[PDB]
Subunit: 29 residues, 6 copies
């Protein structure tokens, strides 16, 4: 379904944001 | 429901953005 | 309702991007 | 209604994204 | 539509995100 | 459909995020 595909994109977005959040944390040494 | 699920992913999103807002406040 | 839930999480999202905007604004000024 | 409320939050999100971009450009 | 309107704001979001990556591309 | 249109913008959004994500990594290096 298209609602399911919408959740899938939101999920991929969340993990990209997860990674960036981690970079900032790492970069904060 | 797939709307509930959509909401969950937005919740996770706000969680990461919050973490990011902080690490900026932390640098 | 579930659409309300979605709108509420987008409000929260908009908020964090506001905070992030301010921190960047800070770095500049 | 609710779909409207969603568009207006998106709008607000777009606006804040634009604010961040401006601040990036403004460092140099 | 309202759905149509949501897509336009999401399109606006994509655009601002693309501007952020451009400034970042300038730094990096 | 309009839902597919929405899912496609979310796909475009994930892409730019991904690029920004790779920008932060390059700085980390
Ligand atoms: Br950023």
């Amino acid at each position: 379904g298209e609602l399911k595909a919408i959740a899938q994109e939101l999920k991929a977005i969340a993990k990209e944001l997860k990674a960036i959040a981690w970079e900032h944390k790492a970069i904060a040494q």
